[PDB]
Amino acid sequence: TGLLDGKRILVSGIITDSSIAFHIARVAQEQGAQLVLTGFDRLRLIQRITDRLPAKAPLLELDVQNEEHLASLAGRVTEAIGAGNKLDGVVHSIGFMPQTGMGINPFFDAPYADVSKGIHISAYSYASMAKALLPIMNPGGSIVGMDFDPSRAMPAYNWMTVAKSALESVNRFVAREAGKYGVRSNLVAAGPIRTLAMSAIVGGALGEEAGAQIQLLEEGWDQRAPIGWNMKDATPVAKTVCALLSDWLPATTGDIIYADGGAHTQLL
Amino acid sequence: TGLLDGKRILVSGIITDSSIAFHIARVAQEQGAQLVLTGFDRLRLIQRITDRLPAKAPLLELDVQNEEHLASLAGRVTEAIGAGNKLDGVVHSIGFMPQTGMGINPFFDAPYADVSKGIHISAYSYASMAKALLPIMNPGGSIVGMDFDPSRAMPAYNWMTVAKSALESVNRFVAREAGKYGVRSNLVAAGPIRTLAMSAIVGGALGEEAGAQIQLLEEGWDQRAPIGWNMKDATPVAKTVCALLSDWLPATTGDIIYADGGAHTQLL
Amino acid sequence: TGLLDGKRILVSGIITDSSIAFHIARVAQEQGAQLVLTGFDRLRLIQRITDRLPAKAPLLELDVQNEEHLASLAGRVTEAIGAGNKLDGVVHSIGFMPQTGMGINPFFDAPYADVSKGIHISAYSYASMAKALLPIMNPGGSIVGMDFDPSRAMPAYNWMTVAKSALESVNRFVAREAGKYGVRSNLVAAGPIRTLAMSAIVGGALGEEAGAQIQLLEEGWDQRAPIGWNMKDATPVAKTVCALLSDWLPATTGDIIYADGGAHTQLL
Amino acid sequence: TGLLDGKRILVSGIITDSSIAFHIARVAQEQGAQLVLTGFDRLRLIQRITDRLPAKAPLLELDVQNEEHLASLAGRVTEAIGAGNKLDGVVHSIGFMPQTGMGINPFFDAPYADVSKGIHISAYSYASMAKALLPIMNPGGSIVGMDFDPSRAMPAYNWMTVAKSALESVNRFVAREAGKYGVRSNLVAAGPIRTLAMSAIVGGALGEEAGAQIQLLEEGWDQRAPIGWNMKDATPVAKTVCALLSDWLPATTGDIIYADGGAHTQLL
Ligand SMILES: NC(=O)c1ccc[n+]([C@@H]2O[C@H](COP(=O)([O-])OP(=O)(O)OC[C@H]3O[C@@H](n4cnc5c(N)ncnc54)[C@H](O)[C@@H]3O)[C@@H](O)[C@H]2O)c1
Ligand SMILES: NC(=O)c1ccc[n+]([C@@H]2O[C@H](COP(=O)([O-])OP(=O)(O)OC[C@H]3O[C@@H](n4cnc5c(N)ncnc54)[C@H](O)[C@@H]3O)[C@@H](O)[C@H]2O)c1
Ligand SMILES: NC(=O)c1ccc[n+]([C@@H]2O[C@H](COP(=O)([O-])OP(=O)(O)OC[C@H]3O[C@@H](n4cnc5c(N)ncnc54)[C@H](O)[C@@H]3O)[C@@H](O)[C@H]2O)c1
Ligand SMILES: NC(=O)c1ccc[n+]([C@@H]2O[C@H](COP(=O)([O-])OP(=O)(O)OC[C@H]3O[C@@H](n4cnc5c(N)ncnc54)[C@H](O)[C@@H]3O)[C@@H](O)[C@H]2O)c1
Ligand SMILES: Oc1cc(CC2CCCCC2)ccc1Oc1ccc(Cl)cc1Cl
Numbered sequence A, B, C, D: 001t002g003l004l005d006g007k008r009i010l011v012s013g014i015i016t017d018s019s020i021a022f023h024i025a026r027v028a029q030e031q032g033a034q035l036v037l038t039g040f041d042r043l044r045l046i047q048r049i050t051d052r053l054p055a056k057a058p059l060l061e062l063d064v065q066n067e068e069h070l071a072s073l074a075g076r077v078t079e080a081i082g083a084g085n086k087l088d089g090v091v092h093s094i095g096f097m098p099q100t101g102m103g104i105n106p107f108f109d110a111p112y113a114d115v116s117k118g119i120h121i122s123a124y125s126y127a128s129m130a131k132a133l134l135p136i137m138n139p140g141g142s143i144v145g146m147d148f149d150p151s152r153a154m155p156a157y158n159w160m161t162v163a164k165s166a167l168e169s170v171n172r173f174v175a176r177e178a179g180k181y182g183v184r185s186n187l188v189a190a191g192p193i194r195t196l197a198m199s200a201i202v203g204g205a206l207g208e209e210a211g212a213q214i215q216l217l218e219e220g221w222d223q224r225a226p227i228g229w230n231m232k233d234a235t236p237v238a239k240t241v242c243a244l245l246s247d248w249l250p251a252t253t254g255d256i257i258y259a260d261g262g263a264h265t266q267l268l
């Protein structure tokens, strides 16, 4: 077995054990992948979490806003996996939007400096990670990023929706570059998952008419999904990412795969 | 290994060894599935083909327009796999449209009797196969059908485009029914594959301004696809179907997966 | 004034004064169009209704399933508008699906004979009306049909959803034919309107878990729509149809215009 | 007559007489609107152009990156139209992306500082113009912006595609805000028009494999469009904008109208 046997895969975005990236890494290891991880601010905090993965993995620092971190990334990764070895997979599982761009802050009140930052981290860095890492990927490789369907507007998500729309567009252009390396680029559009990131905005709208809206949005998902949706279980999305990292979707690129219980295909 | 180890899967639509269903069956067997096959008119012709699959499989007759064939299908399948065993997978890989509905026949000149027949076989039968077989599927099961992206109009495809639009809609409703059984329903939208079905219409427009259009359509696909597209190689699509039949896309239903080299994501 | 001054427009689909076609005709007359109407079974019933339009209009019989009615249509229309005059506009505002294909009947229990009939009337007849009438339309003309967004599945709508998916596809192919005449073809996807057609299925699910679902669907529309939605007011949709019949959307064809309060652009 | 009789409409984005905004203003005046215009850097250059409009209009300076220009805009507009008068329409017809984000510059080589600037001007400013001007719009009003379908990737357009994807998302959120004022927000997705903006990138890829790609893209548009497409004629798009500014699409918001000859609805 091992869906990902022999594959070398870089996984960004682990912060806690609820992190989507955490379960992607876990399942990938269960499936025989050898991992390199990146983490952002609290590397020692991140290391404690990554120590509970089924296997050891080098953990490197990557602030996606940091051009020195980006400039050095490929060298550092090759140091980690061994000269003459290349990556077969890359997982981008990172996002951020300042508080003004989400939750209860009026949409019109977000200053562009804040929006711009969120777009830098959530959308542009998909291209910047691909730039850094494509020169060290094997033909038949796979880059995957995380998306939340922004094709319709909704409460609370606000400027992050705009950043995910940008990301979808970025992914299509990354695919054009990656194809030259024989590499695929896709997003997985996940349904809601109880993660540190959304506890943030769920917590940010406690007394408020955005918290109630978010609750309604969540309940509608499991209702719409023909197979249901369990926000407490990240593994169906981790498995989907691993599917795209495997050799089993070899003809799919510039694309989006919906791991959302089928909710997006149903009006109600 | 065996992506589909232990799974029992019914595969319809084999007619020659170029058949998409043929390569789906082949790869599924290579991955440890145990198959039941159905074939339509020339069962002895179909048997010769299915004898070159890596393993033996019961082959049953199914004319999807035949209510007796449909009424008896589940009993016949259970006879084939053994009382107390159920299906984990179903592949619908069938289509037909009379000559008036495609190629060089003017779009307006197709009589509804012909269109209706093509829709019966290409779209409605997805629901009729699901009706027959869901009562004999295991939770966690997967129904897959074959699609050709009908979201834009194009030369030659004509009324089959309409039938695939109907199919996409049917699939979303099948997913609502299948979810009750814990079963997924999805389509794979494939790029063009050199199959008996399209040699038919490719052959039908030899001297004509539909044959040239078809040639242009085919060349544009490999051009648009960031990873290219090889119309002579059905296995990337077979692998995609097997991915959906596996446990690795467990959160995806009522949906369409594009196995088209990423062509649909690129304008040019 | 007169948005449609001097234009000759055929309007099908009037049955009562709640009919979408009724308000399309009314607004068109208010805007200076000269109309020809078609009606289906109860022509004397239809005549009583059409007598309350602001102006007189010839009313002709057209059963869209009747090849003699279709074969004779263009001659009959030209008789009505005068030799040497041609149509500038055509409104298709017709649909039907037998009771088995909607409401509370299980999706799987609709026989294809019933589905086929609904598709004939709701989707195929768009092409058959275009075939009949394009040879009598002026360059710069406009064909419009009525749609209900079938891009997602939903309760109760069932097989009519499939028929509207087919229609969307038909419209794209009609546009290819109409372009040769300098004629546009588009659909207007309306939000729900209290019409005879949906009182039918609203009435059909009185005690039932499809009636409640329909109520929920309706309430969500006005909730989702940024400008709200009033199911009791057909005129915003009539005005939209007239916009497409006018010279003010001259570059739009094979397309769908959403007159739905913007509901389709919002998740909630 | 006068489709826009009595309406007060602000039109941004005039730079030359080939400007889409120029023809929008012109047609709007021909239809009885009273205009206020805004212009960006070369106000005296812009004034020469705007002097050839059918009627006089106040012209104000607006650099959409300038928070003082934005903060003062509504006061300045009301000064221009008269205390106690409000706007019925707003046209956003502005975009910019630095040279690194388009044409022949590799996609990966655009620094975020450049991308961020283009997104600020092309996408974010749609929200910032709505913020400024909604407090001075009448119920039943209309905000329109200009889009180029970014749903698929393509040569040369590069990071502007990403900025238009963001814009589409912004528009859906603007619609949620505007609905509170009884105001509609929509985009018009135009086919290619020979304008100063694209002569820029057409000129930027003279000897190069992006210039040839752009030529191919342009030729395919008129080929795909069932009614053809004339890149030299901006008026079909101006008329479409005026349609959305009128009372004739009263139920359409958060939406995109395609004024592209129907090219987007056809594969080829
Ligand atoms: N949780 C959900 O319901 C959900 C649904 C769909 C998509 N997503 C997406 O999944 C991805 C992962 O988020 P999550 O929900 O697992 O939340 P999370 O908090 O677990 O992960 C977000 C990660 O982004 C990282 N990050 C922030 N700024 C960074 C930067 N400057 N450089 C490098 N890393 C940075 C954080 O350190 C964190 O590890 C995000 O793109 C999110 O938008 C989440
Ligand atoms: N080949 C392509 O380029 C391509 C691309 C996308 C999608 N598809 C779809 O893939 C599917 C398989 O087609 P293929 O290209 O492998 O061609 P094929 O000729 O190999 O397969 C078509 C099958 O449909 C069966 N069939 C016809 N009428 C039937 C009926 N009454 N009952 C039961 N079976 C019936 C035929 O017997 C044949 O086995 C079709 O749905 C087709 O529309 C094909
Ligand atoms: N009412 C809504 O909420 C709504 C929403 C979106 C789209 N639509 C669509 O609008 C169109 C008009 O329907 P309506 O809601 O105004 O209902 P309606 O009952 O007023 O109109 C339906 C019309 O179809 C005609 N018809 C049925 N079979 C025919 C045939 N054999 N030949 C010719 N005409 C035939 C009927 O005579 C009737 O005039 C339909 O296509 C419907 O699907 C309705
Ligand atoms: N021309 C086309 O083929 C085409 C197709 C689809 C969409 N569009 C869109 O139409 C809109 C108008 O562009 P055009 O093609 O008429 O080109 P144009 O050069 O005529 O117009 C662009 C305008 O944007 C203005 N602008 C730039 N930065 C600004 C800022 N800081 N503040 C205020 N204004 C600023 C310029 O002054 C200019 O007036 C753009 O959004 C463009 O993306 C153009
Ligand atoms: O992209 C996401 C999407 C969701 C689902 C969701 C459904 C409830 C309406 C709101 C959002 C949850 C979390 C998401 O990630 C982030 C969100 C904010 C920041 Cl700051 C960082 C990250 Cl990583």
Ligand SMILES: Oc1cc(CC2CCCCC2)ccc1Oc1ccc(Cl)cc1Cl
Residues within 6 Å of the ligand: B094, B095, B096, B097, B098, B147, B148, B155, B156, B157, B160, B191, B192, B193, B195, B197, B198, B200, B214, B217, B218
């Ligand atoms: O659905 C299909 C799609 C294609 C690809 C293609 C691209 C060239 C423009 C035309 C079609 C090829 C074959 C397809 O299957 C059938 C087609 C006709 C009949 Cl009668 C039966 C079947 Cl199964």
Ligand SMILES: Oc1cc(CC2CCCCC2)ccc1Oc1ccc(Cl)cc1Cl
Residues within 6 Å of the ligand: C094, C095, C096, C097, C098, C147, C148, C155, C156, C157, C160, C191, C192, C193, C195, C197, C198, C200, C214, C217, C218
């Ligand atoms: O196409 C339609 C769509 C709707 C809106 C709606 C929203 C409530 C869920 C259900 C449907 C209402 C009426 C519609 O027309 C018809 C419906 C049935 C027949 Cl038999 C004939 C016609 Cl014309």
Ligand SMILES: Oc1cc(CC2CCCCC2)ccc1Oc1ccc(Cl)cc1Cl
Residues within 6 Å of the ligand: D094, D095, D096, D097, D098, D147, D148, D155, D156, D157, D160, D191, D192, D193, D195, D197, D198, D200, D214, D217, D218
């Ligand atoms: O948004 C646009 C779209 C197009 C059509 C087109 C088709 C040929 C492939 C390329 C682009 C032309 C011009 C466009 O406007 C701008 C472009 C650049 C700048 Cl810097 C500013 C503006 Cl306003």
